[PDB]
Symmetry: D3
C-alpha cells in the first residue's frame, strides 16, 4: 500500500542493532487505526529498548516508539475519523508493538487520546511520556492533599525527563519548587523552568537515614527511587505526599512505618504505561491548561530528525542531553 521510514531495532545473536529501515504500509499491525506521525519521542525507556541488556523489549524486531502524536488517515473504527489529531502513547507501543519513532503507525483506537484543544501536535510531544508522568504525579498527589500552600514541593532528579517537567507544572500551579540535582551548573536552567530553590542530591540524602527527620517538604515528585526515597520519606511534612516514577539507583527502599503512621504521609505509585483512558484523558486536559507552563518550549534540548535518531538513542542512556528530544517526522 505506501512506503515510508521507521526506526527498527533488531537482534542478531546477543545484540541489539537499530537503524532506519524503509517499510510498507501493509506490514504494520493491521487492526489499529492508521496514524501519520507528526511528532516524535525520545525517551529513556526508548533508549533501553534499543540496546541489549535494556530489559524493555522481548522479541525483535520491533519498530521503536512508546510516544507518537499525529493525524488519523484511514479508520476502521468509528470512534476516530480521518483528519482527527491524536496522541498515541504508552500501553504496548514501543515495547511489544510497533511504536512511534516512524512516519505512519497502526495503534488501537482504545489507546488514542484526542489531541487537547490547546496543545499542538508538537507541544504534545515536547511533553510525551515524561511529562505525562509528571502531570500524572501532580494529579495523584493533589488528590491526596497536596495544595500550593501546605508548603514547599520537592522535585528530585530535576533535570532529568520527568523532573524537569514536573518542576514547571508545579510551578505553573503556584507551588514553591525546590529542585534537587547532582549537577551544579544546572541551577540556572532549573530556575528558568520554575525552581525557586536548588539543592544537591546530598541535601536530600547523605549518611544513611532515620525514621523521622526535621520536616522539610510537604511532597515530592520523585523520579529516582532507592535508598534516597527512604530518606525523603522521613523528611515529609504532616499529611504530606510522595509520587514515585523511577528507579535510578535503588530498586530497594528501606522505609520505616513511621512517616506513615505518625505523620500521615502517603507514597503514590505512578505508572503511565497502563493508566486507564478516562484518567489519561483528564490528565492530558490538564497538561494543556491548569498545568501548561510558560517555558515548555524551554524544556526542549533538540528537535532532531528520524534520520538523526540512532544517535539520540545513544545519547539519553549516556545522558548527554538536557531536557527532551523531540523527533520531527
Amino acid at each position: 500500500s505506501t512506503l515510508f521510514q521507521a526506526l527498527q531495532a533488531e537482534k542478531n545473536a546477543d545484540d541489539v542493532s537499530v537503524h532506519v529501515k524503509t517499510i510498507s504500509t501493509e506490514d504494520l499491525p493491521k487492526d489499529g487505526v492508521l496514524i501519520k506521525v507528526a511528532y516524535s519521542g525520545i525517551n529513556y525507556k526508548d533508549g533501553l529498548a534499543g540496546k541489549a541488556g535494556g530489559n524493555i523489549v522481548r522479541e525483535y524486531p520491533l519498530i521503536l516508539g512508546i510516544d507518537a502524536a499525529g493525524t488519523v488517515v484511514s479508520s476502521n473504527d468509528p470512534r476516530f475519523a480521518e483528519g482527527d489529531e491524536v496522541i498515541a502513547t504508552s500501553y504496548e507501543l514501543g515495547v511489544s508493538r510497533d511504536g512511534g519513532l516512524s512516519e505512519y503507525a497502526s495503534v488501537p483506537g482504545d489507546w488514542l487520546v484526542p489531541l487537547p484543544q490547546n496543545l499542538s501536535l508538537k507541544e504534545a510531544m515536547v511533553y510525551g511520556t515524561a511529562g505525562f508522568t509528571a502531570a500524572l504525579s501532580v494529579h495523584r498527589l493533589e488528590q491526596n492533599g497536596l495544595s500550593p500552600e501546605k508548603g514547599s514541593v520537592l522535585v528530585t532528579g530535576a533535570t532529568g525527563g520527568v523532573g524537569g517537567i514536573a518542576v514547571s507544572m508545579l510551578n505553573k500551579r503556584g507551588y514553591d519548587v525546590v529542585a534537587s540535582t547532582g549537577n551544579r551548573e544546572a541551577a540556572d536552567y532549573l530556575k528558568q523552568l520554575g525552581a525557586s530553590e536548588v539543592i544537591s542530591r546530598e541535601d536530600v540524602y547523605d549518611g544513611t537515614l532515620k525514621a523521622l527527620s526535621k520536616q522539610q517538604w510537604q511532597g515530592a515528585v520523585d523520579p529516582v527511587g532507592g535508598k534516597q526515597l527512604a530518606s525523603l520519606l522521613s523528611k515529609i511534612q504532616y499529611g504530606g505526599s510522595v509520587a514515585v516514577s523511577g528507579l535510578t539507583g535503588g530498586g530497594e527502599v528501606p522505609a520505616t512505618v513511621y512517616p506513615f503512621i505518625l505523620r500521615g504521609v502517603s507514597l503514590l505509585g505512578i505508572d503511565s504505561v497502563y493508566c486507564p483512558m478516562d484518567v489519561r484523558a483528564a490528565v492530558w486536559e490538564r497538561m494543556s491548561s491548569d498545568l501548561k507552563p510558560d517555558q515548555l518550549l524551554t524544556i526542549v534540548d533538540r528537535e532532531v530528525s528520524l534520520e538523526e535518531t540512532p544517535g539520540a538513542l545513544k545519547d539519553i542512556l549516556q545522558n548527554r542531553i538536557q531536557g527532551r528530544v523531540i523527533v520531527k517526522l
Copy 2:
C-alpha cells in the same frame, strides 16, 4: 466541684504506677470544657502509656485516655452547651494531658466531635480510636481508587482492634474481605465479623521477599506494619492501595520501588492522632451510616469497668484480647 475516680499513672521510682485514684474537678486543667464521661477504651496505645517507659507518656502524673464519650456539664466555650453529647479522642488526650477513662475530663473545644445522630455514646467508644483508625483507613483507600468490584481487600492483623472493625466496615460497604491471623480458631469469629475468607499470617508473608508476586488483593487495611507489609505491597493488584496504621510485626518495611512504579499501587499512612477536624467529623459521620456494621457489638470482648482497668491495660500488650473492651462509668 465534686470528687471522682480517675485512673492515674505515676513514675514512682522507675516502674510506673496505673492505679484507680480520686480527684477533684479543680484539679482537672481549668481551660477545657468539662465532660462527664459515660464511656471509654482501652486501646493498645493506652497499654503502652501504662508500661515501663513505652515511649508514649513523657510528663508524670497522667490520667489515661485517648478515647472518651460523654456529656458537657459546664463549658466556657461558646461552641458547646451543657447537655451536648460529644466524642473526645486523639490530640494530646491520654498522652501529654489528662485523658478519657476517668468520669470527668476537661478537653479543649477544638477536639470535640458532636456525637453523630445514629450512634449512641456506647457505640462511639465501642468504635474508639481503633474503629476511627479503620474507618479513616477505608476513607483513605477510597480516595485512592478503592472499590468493591476491583477485587478483595485484605485486612491484616484481623482480630485486633483496628483489623476487627476494618473487616466489618469493609463488609458493610460490600467488599470481599480477606482476613489474616496468627491463630486458627479465630476463623468463625472472623467469618461472622464479615470475613469472606481466613488465611494465615504465613499466606501473607513466610515466603519472605520478592520484588513482584502474583496479584491477590485489590488493597489492604494493615494495622500490622513490618516485613509483612513489604511482602503484601508485592501482592496488590494494579492501581490498588494499602493503608498502614500500626506497628505490630515491625518498624522496618524493606520495599522495592516496583509495585509502585510498575503497578501504580499506593501506600497511605493513617494517623488518627492529628487528623483535621473536618475529616474527623466526616469520618464519624460515615461511621454512623455508610460504615456502621450490623454486627458492631460483636467486636466486644465484654465491657469492663474503671476499677477493673489495670487488668486489660494488661492484655493488650499480649494479644489475649479478641476485638475490644469498653469501659462504662
Copy 3:
C-alpha cells in the same frame, strides 16, 4: 362549555360573605391552564380572605383558594398536557386571582408544579401551604447549617398548621424535636407527630427578655414570631438558626444584636407566596421523600365537602382545628 361549583367571596357595602355559587368554565380567567381540581385547601390565609378586615383580598368578587391539586384538562400552553397531575399554590391564587376552593381553576403554567411521583394528590393537599411553608423552613435552616446532632430543634406554635407538619418533617429527618404550645392536652397529639419532649409557651417566653440566655436549642421553626421570637433568639446555640414564617404572636420583635454577632445565629424569613419555581419544585421533591413523615395522614383533622367550606373557613380563625382541614372536590 361547563358548570361547576366554587366557593366564592362577594362584598357589598362591606361584609363579604362567601357562598358556593355555580360558575361556568367560561368565566374563569382565560389566560391560565384549566384544571380539574381534586383536593383542597383550608388555610388560615383563606379564613382571612373570607372576612372583612382580613386584609388579604384587595378587591372583591373572588373564588377563595391559595391551594389546589388536580389534573390538567385543557391546556393552551405546551408545558402541560391533558392528563398531567399538578399542584397549584401561592402567588396570586386565592388572593388577587380565582383560587382552588372550586373544582376547576384557571392557573398560569408558570405556577403549576408537576406532582412528585411519590406523593398523591390527596397527600399534596394534606400538606398544602402550611406544609410547604414548614418544608421550606427546614430547607432554609439546613442551608444555614442545621443538622440532626448539632442539638435539639424547637418548633413553636406546634398544633398550628405549620408547627404540626414541621414537627413531623424534622423528626422524619432524624432531628430531636422539642414542641411548644399553649395547650396542655396536646402533649400526646404532639408526641405522636414526632416530638421528643413538649414544652409550654412560657418555657420559651415568660422571663421576659435578656440579650443572651442559657443556650437551649440550635434552632427553631417559628410560625409564632413576636416577643417570643426575641427571647427564643437568645436561647439559640452557637451558629444555630431560626425560620420565621408567621406572626401569630405579634409583629414587633424587640431583637438585640447579641445572638447574631456573638453566637452567629441567623434569622431566615420564609415566605412561600413568591418563592422561585426552582426551589418550589426542589422542596416539593423533598416533601415527597426525605421530608415525608410516616405519620402524615395523622395530621388531617377532617375532610370536608365544598358545601361544608364556609363551615370551616370560620373554624380556622376560631382557631378550633388541630392540624389540617383538607377539602375533597
Copy 4:
C-alpha cells in the same frame, strides 16, 4: 530563650494600663506553637481590651492581640514545621490568652491557618479580624442568595475596619456597592475603595422606623446594628439578606417580623471569634482570590511600630482611624 517586646495590659486595681514591657519566650504559655510574629493589627476589640470596664479582658495581665501573621519557629505539633507561614486570629487570642501585638507568641495549633499562596504576611494583617469578618459576611450572604445582579448592596460603617474592606470585596466580585457614612468628606475615598454611590447615615435611617419601606438593596453588610439595622431591614429586596457584625449605634434592634415573613429576608450573625477551622480556612482562601481586591493597600491608614501602638489603641476607639491600622514587628 531570648527576650522580646510585647504590648502587655495590666490592671492597676482600677486603672487598666497597657505598656510596652519586655518579656521572655520562657514566659509564654507552654502548650502552643512558638511563632515569630511579623505583623500586626489594631481592631476595635483591641481598644476595648485596653480601656477599663471595656468588658473584654477576662483576668488581667495579658499581651494584647487578637491578630497575628508570622512564622512557625520550632513546634511540638507535628501539624506545623519551623519555617511555615501562618495566621493566628481569634478564639482566645488577645482576649483570654496572649495575642500578637508582640514579636513572638505561642498560639495553639488548632487555631493556625497556613498563609495562602497569594497573600504575603503583611496582606494577611492588612485584613485582620476586620477583613475576615468582611469576607465571612459576604460568604454567608452569598450562601443566602446574594448574587451580583439581584441589586445593589449596602455597606454601613464604610471607612470603618469591616465596612471599608467589605466595600472593596463586594466590588471585587462585581457587585454594585452603595456605601454609607457618618461623614461627608470621605466620599472620594469610599469610591476609590470601589463604592458606586455614597450616601449618608440619614439615607439609611432618618425617617426612622416603618415595617416595609420602598425596596432598596438586595442585601447589606452591616458593622453598625441598632435601630439603623431595623430601618434598613425594611428596605431589602425580595429574598435578600443582611449580615451583621457590629453594634456601633446600638445593641437593640427594634425589628418587625414583616420583611422576614413577607419579603423572605434573612439576617445573618457573623462571629469571627469561633467560626470553625473549615470555613475559616475556606474563607481565607477566598480572601486571596475571588475576594482579593486590587486596592487592599488603599485601606491602610498607617503602619506603626510596637511602641506607637499605645497611641493607636486609644485612637482606634473614639473614632479617628479611617480604614485600618497595621502594626509591624
Copy 5:
C-alpha cells in the same frame, strides 16, 4: 398615567398593516410589571408577526416584540423593585401579548430575568431571542458530549442571527467552527465572527442523501433544518449531536436512523419560547461570561430606531440582514 410610542400590528378585514402608534400606559395589560424598555430586537419571528399569513400572531390589536430589556418602572410584584434592570423575552411576548418593540411594556414578573452583571442592556438585546437560542443550543450540545477537542463544529445558516452568534460563542469557547452560508463572500465577515473555515450550502447538502456519509463534524448548531439537515446528520463524528432550532430550509426532515443507532449521534430540539426560568437564567449567565464573545458588537448590522422598525421587519424576512438589527428606545 403616560403616552408613548409602539410598533403595533393591526389587521383590517384582510391585510396586516404594522406602524408606530401612540398608545398610553393605561392600555398595557394591567396584570404584569411595567418596564421602560431601553432596547430592541429584530427577530425573524418578529417579521412573521407583522406579516399577512405569517401565522404567529393569532389575534390583532397587538404590539410586536418577543424581545425587550429595560428598567422596572413600577411593580405590584414583590419580586421586582422600581429600578431593576431586566430582560423580557419569550413566553407570550410579541406573539399573543403586547411585546418589546415600544417604550413601555407590561410583563409578568414570572418572565423577567434580571440583567446579568456583565451585560449591558444594549448587549442583552444584541443577543436577544436569537442569541439566547445560540447559547441555549450550545448548552444542550454540551450536555450531550460536545467538547472542543472532539472535533470541529458546523454552523449552518451562519450569517443570520442565531447562526452568526452561534459561530462566535463556539469560538470563544475555543471550538473549531465551520460556518456554512450561501451568501458567498460574506466569507470574511464569518471570519470576524470566529469561523475557522467557511463552506457553502452545497458542501453541507447537494443533490442527494445517503444513510451514512464520510464523518465530517462532530456537532452542528442548526437554524436552518430541513432536507439539508437529514443531509448533515449523516455527516457527524461518532457520538456527536446537532441542535436544531428553525425551518428556513423547510420543515420535513427525512432522516434515517443509522447515525443515531450506528453512530450514536443525537438530535436536540431547541425552543427558546417556553424554556424554564431555571435554565433560562443559567443560560443568561453563560451569555454574560463563558459564551460571551470578544466581537459581540460585530454581529450588529445596524442600530435602527422605533420609527425605522417597519422597514427592518421587511428586511429580515428576505435575507437582507447580516447579523442583527438592534432597536434603541
Copy 6:
C-alpha cells in the same frame, strides 16, 4: 495447553454454517486476556452474524458472540489478575474477533469491565448487550430531562430483549411505564415486567402522519423505531426525549422539525458497540443498583447450552423468543 468447545461460523461454499467445534487455546487470538467464559446470550446481531447476507460478520471462520461474562484465567496484561470476574461485550467481539459463544475467549483488556459487586456472572448475561442498551437508553434520556413525574414513558417493541428490560428498569426507577406491542395476548407478561398500561403499535402509529400530535408521553425508549418513530416523535411532551437504538420498523425516519423546534424534544441515538469504557462501566454500575429490577430473571425465556445454541440462533429472527435466551457453559 488445553482445548475446549465453541460455536463457530464458517462459510464453506456460500451458505454460512454454524456448528459447535473443538478448538484449542493455542488457536485463540493471542494478545487478548484469556477468560474462561461462564455465560452468553443470544442477540439479534448474533442471529445475523450467522445468516448469510445477514451482514454483520464480514469475514468467516469467526467464533460468534458479542456478550460473555467470565473469569480471568491468567493474563498478560497487568490490569487483570486471575480469578477476576469480568464482562466482555461489544467492540469487535463476535463481529470481527472471536466472541463469547465459546468456553474460553481472548478478549483484549481494554474491553473488559470488572463484574459489578451486586451482579452474578449469570445476571450479567441475563442482561447482556440488549440490556446494556436498555440501561444506556435510560442513562441518556435522564441526561436530557427524563424524571418519573414529567409524565409517563413509552417503550415500543415491548417484547424483545431491549424493550422487555427497559420496561422492568424504568419501573424500577419509579416511572409510569406504557408498553406498546403488536402481540395481543402478552399483556400480562408486560404488566408483570412492570408495564402499567399496555397498548398496540396501532395506538402509537397507524394513523399514518402528522407534524404535531396530542402530547402523550415524555419519552420513549425506542428499540424498534422507523416510520412509527416519526409518529411517536409527534406525541412526546414538551422537553421530552426519545432514545433510539434499533431498526425493525424500517431505517427510514421521515420526520419533521416541529416536535424538535416547538416542543424542544430530542432524539438520542443509542449505540452499545463503541460506548467508552467510562460511561460503559458507570452504566453497568446502575444496572446493579439504580436500575436493577426485582423482576430480572422473569425476562429469561430459557437457559440453553452450547449444543442447543444453533437452534436459538435460528429462533431469534422469527420471533419465537419472548424474553432473552442465556447460555450456560
